[PDB]
Nucleic acid binder design. Structure first.
Length: 1342
RNA sequence: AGAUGAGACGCGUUUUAGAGCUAGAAAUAGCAAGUUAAAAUAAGGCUAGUCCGUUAUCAACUUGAAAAAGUGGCACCGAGUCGGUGCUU
DNA sequence: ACGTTTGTACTCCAGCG
DNA sequence: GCTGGAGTACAAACGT
């Protein structure tokens, strides 16, 4: 009844690997009983396998389509509101006008009225359309002319102006402060000068209206604007901002000296995320300045459209569109004349061919403005007399349409002013317009605020609003019905996120003063000072740090570190940088912003006004409606002034922090009586940063954080996964891991295991670093030696550039071409510090003789000054310099060894600790007498470097492209590595096994002397012959044992053979998770009308043969149907077994009632109990062993899996990385000799793939093309051959058929679009592990 | 680092309306023009709201209205997708 | 037996700023 | 971008 097994797990985003081992590291195999109606009754199966599934999706797409649905509903409601105000008199002018306008979509055969909607006859409609060629002619006529106009025309203009109404980015009416180009240009310059104040630009005599708004090519407008400013250049920072505001796409990489490219364009949809990334790499003080650039661009593009003399016409948008219409007509007839005289042969191509990108494609085809311009530019350059059209063409103002992509810069008050002008002009001619002016204006200007949300009655997951009365919320009685304060309160309580550390506490705003002081002091506590006579840089004292902050940061915002001491040590301490950058990045921006708002330092400096400013910051952060901001600032009025109230209204902070106030000023250590903010304020001899306070075992912040995280999530498994942090793709994998764990517990006779091992899946920059270092030292790597650092990506090239071509310990240079004379020595040998910081390049010296320390005292005396110069030139990092100076720092100490072992051992990702918490909570469910948890499973978590090194030292090599066996193999290897680490070192269970107990100290456990873990590695106990530092060897015992208990754990000969046998094992359990497809109904494109029958109706009574519609419907699942069908013309009932797919629309209509749906489909005398539901990836087994996975109603996928012998995959790895061995020269030479000695494995593996594909793939055209290509490229080097041989493996891979490329030739995918072979197969119903099956022989069904 | 949520614009697409002219019986040709508007924008659902409809969850079989629970012997020798031997059921 | 109705090979396509 | 839908040309398979 005791089995003593263990479970290993590999968790990925698309895969879960699992394995079961015994105590002898051997996976057991058991025979399982299968159900169904076939004759098989016992399948011997191995307890190792993987589970594959589709990636989980985020809900942003659903959010966007939900939002779009809401705007379409609200727009239709606005139109309907205008209809019900106009109906009673629209009935007088034309009783069935609104019916004509509603049903205008349909065909003349389906119309109950005349075809023409507006007037309803022929001659008046043509007369109207000749009088007003566009809607803007009619709008200008209605605003300008004072004659009595028809009510239908007033309605049409009003509804066009209400339906399309522009944005709401400008609060209040348009005034020259917030609309004019000059005022916003001065605001942008003021923001720039405020942000720097050192070498500023002063623009007082400039005329930004004359330069920016001029009808000029935008590059030349940029050039003229820059030409006025003497200091700034074209590609300067403010120059690139002016270019960005003009509509260009400039690079900001050289502006902030960022190596990565920094092209930012307003017109791109990606600008939001690109600005977030750019601001992340350059600091967030550039936020308001770039926002002002966006505002300047809005003003510029508004004046580009609105470019008519407004003194002669009160409606400027209609007159501007009139001008654009007239210039389009003039250039159209002019272009017609020039292509008639110059190029008459191409006339039908430009003006008639809709398929091309000419004018016919520009008007009738799908050609945009950019593609039309790119088409017509080289034709226009070829003719003569077309200078004007080119001047318009570089300005994007040639043959321009009215409804363009760039009408999004039009604010709503332009349409509101036109509406108000129309209502004044036609006022005294209809009394009802005088009665309902304000109602129509309110219809246009009303906008549901952010905090009110969707107006629901109770049946909504997303609504939080509350009502005072119970009636319909029209826009006019909105304030009389909607309870605004309680809606705002519910919005605050429900939408602001919770903290990761405290799920029941509330985070801070990003610009909130507690978090500002927290981050300032978090970067300030790790700052030393260097003054007069003092050898050891001590950190800044808490009183000194507080005084320095209050005297510099609160006075000059962003403070230079050189200016820091200049004003702290040289001036304040009167003693003329350490632990800091050139300047202190963190600053109290909100503090100085509110200082400029209020002009009272004493109000901000008072600790009693802290909650006042806190509530101000929160209200300006989360709220954006002006009335609600004023209403919640109304309580804060009597302590303030009205002017300051106006400035506080204008200011809008945005963003949220990650910390809670209970986690800064709330948590208090009972033994010490100080907070986290008090520790950062003054910690005496520590001044530890935030992580070090929350990572302290001597403090209660561990016990508080661990206890407060408990019961922050629900008792249910789904609830516990749901509001846990992380991507939904990782949540799907975690849930599948819990499911496979419980069924694996079930399969071993309800036995809890011992361990459940868990593992979570996890050049130009160098050239910029090398060029900066070479320029800092004045090196000849780019002067005398050629500058090719962009192509220097090899490790030898990396080291050679980083060491300036001079070896680290050798006091000379080294030839760049002669890399064999040089060598690479790791600094800390077996931590596995394989990074280039520890991997110094040593030409001759072999560390000068040492055991574990990288340098000697003589080596330190050699590479002291040169290494100091390299660190000053940023070539040598601080960690690398400490490693190279450890010998003069004391060699290798026991504390450094403790750091090395805890570095290979402690995982840092919180998601791993979390998933360990669910599995440990779901398996340990018993309590002791004193209510103590009974640990029956030791949950063990590792990191991927351990198992990666376990692959690369003992040649258990993995390539990913042969089969999906590597998931289960990684799970098995993780299991054996974790169990070996807990068997050899059981006292280290406090470091990585879940739970806090028996903490111990690695400081003394290293023991620092010959006769637990003395060497600088935590996995060295596997290696049978450990190497040394300065070219020496050290043997190891064969059988490993525990120090105290007598237990053999790593007998070398018998366990390596077992792991080889398990890795080379042909059958593991690969299961693809069957899913019912959900999502969109079909493709979203709307196609023109067709005679074909696979067009889906867009509505009920819109037949697609005369209306168009969608196609390619997504099949939810499939149903096997046996029935009869109509045969012949003589009413013959021929029985037919058929597979039919069910669309999502049909999924609802078919799960409602299946039977009558099938009768209405065309089937008769169906068998109701023989309806087999087949979801996606349903496994079918065929003759000889062929497996097919169902992809749709009429498409299958590859189902089999290729089991390659381990010699072949080891050879495939070793030949692939011929030039990337990265080891000893002797080991690399031996590997090269081995791979050049065995090369017939290529022919053997081609025979293997040929037999497998001839067996289960049946794609003989592609297979013959592969064989001919392989014979064509026989005389080829092995390294080039291996990469395309492993590219070849996607022909026989599992899943969808893909298209691949072997060498030159590209092989096209063989798709399986026939399911007629499936109905005479054996359907397989697999469990979550696939150990439990149900096989149905479909030949015997029906 | 990463989930979720609220408010809005601008296009785009599809049908229809913007009478096309001259010569030949036709096939066709030559010529003139073109920029806009309406409606829909997941079919639709009922609790009829200026709501909701693409996230998450899902092998089979037996109970249960659902929720949920329950259903499959063990060792040894081997390995081309798992096979064989023995004990007991 | 004549002639009309299903399987293979290939190409193109997919709402967005 | 991946991968299933749809169209089209063409021959094989077959129903009348």
């Amino acid at each position: 009844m005791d089995k003593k097994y263990s479970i290993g797990l590999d968790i990925g985003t698309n895969s879960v690997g699992w394995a079961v081992i015994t105590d002898e590291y051997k996976v057991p195999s058991k025979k399982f009983k299968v159900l169904g109606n076939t004759d098989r009754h016992s399948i011997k199966k191995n307890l190792i396998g993987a589970l594959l599934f589709d990636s989980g999706e985020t809900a942003e797409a659903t959010r966007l389509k939900r939002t779009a649905r809401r705007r379409y509903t609200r727009r239709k409601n606005r139109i309907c509101y205008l209809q019900e105000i106009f109906s009673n008199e629209m009935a007088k002018v034309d009783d069935s006008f609104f019916h004509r306008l509603e049903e205008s979509f349909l065909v003349e055969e389906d119309k109950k009225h005349e075809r023409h909607p507006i007037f309803g006859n022929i001659v008046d409609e043509v007369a109207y359309h000749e009088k007003y060629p566009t809607i803007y002619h009619l709008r200008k006529k209605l605003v300008d002319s004072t004659d009595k106009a028809d009510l239908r025309l007033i309605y049409l203009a009003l509804a066009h102006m209400i339906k399309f109404r522009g944005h709401f980015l400008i609060e209040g009416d348009l005034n020259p402060d917030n609309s004019d180009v000059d005022k916003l240009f001065i605001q942008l310059v003021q923001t720039y000068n405020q942000l720097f104040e050192e070498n500023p630009i002063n623009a007082s005599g400039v005329d930004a209206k004359a330069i920016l708004s001029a009808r000029l090519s935008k590059s030349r407008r940029l050039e003229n604007l820059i030409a006025q400013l003497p200091g700034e250049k074209k590609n300067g920072l403010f120059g690139n901002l002016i270019a960005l505001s003009l509509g260009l796409t400039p690079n900001f990489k050289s502006n902030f000296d960022l190596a990565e490219d920094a092209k930012l364009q307003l017109s791109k949809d990606t600008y939001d995320d690109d600005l977030d990334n750019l601001l992340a790499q350059i600091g967030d003080q550039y936020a308001d300045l770039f926002l002002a650039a966006k505002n300047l661009s809005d003003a510029i593009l508004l004046s580009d459209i609105l470019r008519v003399n407004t003194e002669i016409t009160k409606a400027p948008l209609s007159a501007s569109m009139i001008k654009r219409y007239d210039e389009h007509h003039q250039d159209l007839t002019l272009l017609k004349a020039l292509v008639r005289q110059q190029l008459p042969e191409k006339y039908k191509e430009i003006f008639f061919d809709q398929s091309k990108n000419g004018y016919a494609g520009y008007i009738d085809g799908g050609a945009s403005q950019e593609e039309f311009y790119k088409f017509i530019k080289p034709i226009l350059e070829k003719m003569d007399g077309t200078e004007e059209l080119l001047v318009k063409l570089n300005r994007e103002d040639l043959l321009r349409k009215q409804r363009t992509f760039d009408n999004g810069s039009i604010p709503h008050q332009i349409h509101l002013g036109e509406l108000h002008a129309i209502l004044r002009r036609q006022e005294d001619f209809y009394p009802f317009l005088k009665d309902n002016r304000e109602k129509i204006e309110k219809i246009l200007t009303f906008r549901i605020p952010y905090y009110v949300g969707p107006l629901a009655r109770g049946n909504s997951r997303f609504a939080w609003m509350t009502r005072k009365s119970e009636e319909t919320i029209t826009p006019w009685n909105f304030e009389e019905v909607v309870d605004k304060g309680a809606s705002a309160q519910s919005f605050i309580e429900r939408m602001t996120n919770f903290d990761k550390n405290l799920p029941n506490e509330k985070v801070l705003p990003k610009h909130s003063l507690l978090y500002e002081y927290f981050t300032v002091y978090n970067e300030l506590t790790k700052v030393k000072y260097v003054t007069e006579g003092m050898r050891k840089p001590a950190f800044l004292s808490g009183e000194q740090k507080k005084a320095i902050v209050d005297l510099l940061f609160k006075t000059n915002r962003k403070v230079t570190v050189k200016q820091l001491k200049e004003d702290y040590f040289k001036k304040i301490e009167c003693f003329d940088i350490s632990g800091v950058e050139d300047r202190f990045n963190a600053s109290l921006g909100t503090y100085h912003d509110l200082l400029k708002i209020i002009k009272d330092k004493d109000f901000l400096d008072n600790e009693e006004n802290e909650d006042i400013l806190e509530d101000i910051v929160l209200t300006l952060t989360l709220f954006e409606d002006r009335e609600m901001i004023e209403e919640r600032l109304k309580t804060y009025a009597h302590l303030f002034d009205d002017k300051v109230m106006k400035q506080l209204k204008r200011r809008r902070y945005t963003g949220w922090g990650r910390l809670s106030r209970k986690l800064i000023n709330g948590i208090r250590d009972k033994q010490s009586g100080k907070t986290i903010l008090d520790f950062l304020k003054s910690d005496g001899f520590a001044n530890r940063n935030f992580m070090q306070l929350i990572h302290d075992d001597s403090l209660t912040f561990k016990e508080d954080i661990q206890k407060a995280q408990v019961s922050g999530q629900g008792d249910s498994l789904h609830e516990h996964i749901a509001n846990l942090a992380g991507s939904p793709a990782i949540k799907k994998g975690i849930l599948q891991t819990v499911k496979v764990v419980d069924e694996l517990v079930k399969v071993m006779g309800r036995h809890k295991p011992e361990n459940i091992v868990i593992e979570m899946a996890r050049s130009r920059e160098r050239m910029k670093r090398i060029e900066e270092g070479i320029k800092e030292l004045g090196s000849q790597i780019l002067k005398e030696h050629p500058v090719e650092n962009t192509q220097l990506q090899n490790e030898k090239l990396y080291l050679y550039y980083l060491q300036n071509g001079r070896d680290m310990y050798v006091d000379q240079e080294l030839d760049i071409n002669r890399l064999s004379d040089y060598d690479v020595d790791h600094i800390v040998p077996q931590l596995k510090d394989d990074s280039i910081d520890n991997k110094v390049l040593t030409r001759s010296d072999k560390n000068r003789g040492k055991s574990d320390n990288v340098p000697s005292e003589e080596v330190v005396k050699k590479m002291k000054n040169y290494w100091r110069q390299l660190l000053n030139a940023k070539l040598i990092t601080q960690r690398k310099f400490d490693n190279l100076t450890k010998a003069e720092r004391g060699g290798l100490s026991e504390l450094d060894k403790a750091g090395f072992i805890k570095r290979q051992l402690v995982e840092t990702r919180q998601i791993t600790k979390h998933v360990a918490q669910i599995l440990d909570s779901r398996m340990n469910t018993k309590y002791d007498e004193n209510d103590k948890l009974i640990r029956e499973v030791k949950v063990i978590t590792l990191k991927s470097k351990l198992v990666s090194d376990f692959r690369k030292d003992f040649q258990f090599y993995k390539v990913r492209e042969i089969n999906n066996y590597h998931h289960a193999h990684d799970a098995y290897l993780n299991a054996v590595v974790g169990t070996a680490l807990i068997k050899k070192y059981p006292k280290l269970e406090s470091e990585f096994v879940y739970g806090d107990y028996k903490v111990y100290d690695v400081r003394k456990m290293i023991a620092k002397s010959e006769q637990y873990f003395f060497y600088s590695n935590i996995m060295n106990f596997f290696k049978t012959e450990i190497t040394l530092a300065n070219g020496e060897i050290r043997k190891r015992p064969l059988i490993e044992t525990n120090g105290e208990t007598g237990e053999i754990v790593w007998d070398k000969g018998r366990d390596f053979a077992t792991v080889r046998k398990v890795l080379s094992m042909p059958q593991v359990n690969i299961v693809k998770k069957t899913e019912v497809q959900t999502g969109g109904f079909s493709k979203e494109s709307i196609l023109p009308k067709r005679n074909s029958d696979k067009l889906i109706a867009r509505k009920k009574d819109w037949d697609p043969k005369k209306y168009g519609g969608f196609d390619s419907p997504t099949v939810a699942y499939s149903v096997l149907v046996v029935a009869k069908v109509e045969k012949g013309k003589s009413k013959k009932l021929k029985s037919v077994k058929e597979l039919l797919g069910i669309t999502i629309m049909e999924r609802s209509s078919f799960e409602k009632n299946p039977i009558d749906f099938l009768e209405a489909k065309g089937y008769k005398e169906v068998k109701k109990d023989l309806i087999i539901k087949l979801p996606k990836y349903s496994l079918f087994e065929l003759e000889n062993g062929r497996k097919r996975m169902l992809a749709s109603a009429g498409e299958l996928q590859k189902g089999n899996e290729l089991a390659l012998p381990s010699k072949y995959v080891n050879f495939l790895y070793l030949a692939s990385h011929y030039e990337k061995l990265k080891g000893s020269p002797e080991d690399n030479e031996q590997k090269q000799l081995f791979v050049e000695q065995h090369k017939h494995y290529l022919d053997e593996i081609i025979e293997q793939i040929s037999e497998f594909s001839k067996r289960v793939i049946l794609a003989d055209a592609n297979l013959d093309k592969v064989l001919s290509a392989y014979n064509k490229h026989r005389d080829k080097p092995i390294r080039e051959q291996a990469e395309n041989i492993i590219h070849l493996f996607t022909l026989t891979n599992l899943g969808a058929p893909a298209a691949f490329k072997y060498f030159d030739t590209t092989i096209d995918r063989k798709r399986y679009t026939s399911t007629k072979e499936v109905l005479d197969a054996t359907l397989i119903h697999q469990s979550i592990t696939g150990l439990y099956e149900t096989r149905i022989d479909l030949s015997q069904l029906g």
